[PDB]
């Protein structure tokens with residue numbers, strides 16, 4: 001009954017004659033009627049703070065240049081590789097012959113087989129980019 | 136309804152009201168929608184008396200909330216050294232991570248409780 005009335009940016013607290021208290025520093029409540037304030041995501045070094053933490057809303061974060069987010073809400077950072085590379089466990093390795101990567105993240109993918117759709121290789125592929133199919 | 140009454144009892148810090156509600160067969164591990172047990176609540180608001188009786192009545196010491204925080208995380212964050220110590224003696228997971236991959240030691244440091252962080256770092 002006395003906790004339902006508590007807004008966001010606040011938690012239910014009936015120890016000390018107050019009905020609700022404000023969320024302590026580096027914590028937040030995004031709903032009202034919360035029994036406990038959730039802890040702010042901290043973001044330094046490789047992680048860069050994009051949205052700062054408020055009393056009522058969590059911080060959001062990306063990865064510094066030369067890195068890219070992996071997983072929901074940038075859970076962990078992964079090293080960028082060059083175009084025509086993939087990230088192996090050994091590190092940034094160049095793509096094998098019949099395969100390309102047009103991005104600075106992810107695996108090498110094989111060139112398109114034009115024959116499948118009936119078309120012919122208009123422009124050849126490379127490590128950096130896919131085949132262009134034609135007739 | 137007995138579970139809801141026990142969470143409020145633990146929150147408000149009413150030692151006798153908890154003892155009665157437990158003795159009336161209330162679920163000691165009663166989660167809310169945020170996965171918050173009586174022990175989390177007691178740990179959050181520094182109610183040692185109630186932390187002790189909830190543990191003695193078979194509270195899950197390593198109960199995780201919806202965002203992965205344990206009673207030790209809360210005690211550590213909220214600067215409740217004696218409750219931190221009691222939870223450790225009751226077999227609390229000292230290197231447990233939350234969703235955001237932060238140990239109670241990290242939360243203690245975040246809230247500037249170096250004293251408590253040192254206790255947690257010595258224990259494994």
Ligand SMILES: *[C@@H]1O[C@H](CO)[C@@H](O)[C@H](O[C@H]2O[C@@H](C)[C@@H](O)[C@@H](O)[C@@H]2O)[C@H]1NC(C)=O
Pocket residue numbers: 121122123124
């Ligand atoms: C793909 O690479 C080949 C060398 O590695 C090169 O010879 C191909 O271009 C030539 O192929 C011959 C058969 C002829 O069609 C000529 O006009 C091409 O320049 C190259 N393929 C393409 C489509 O550039």
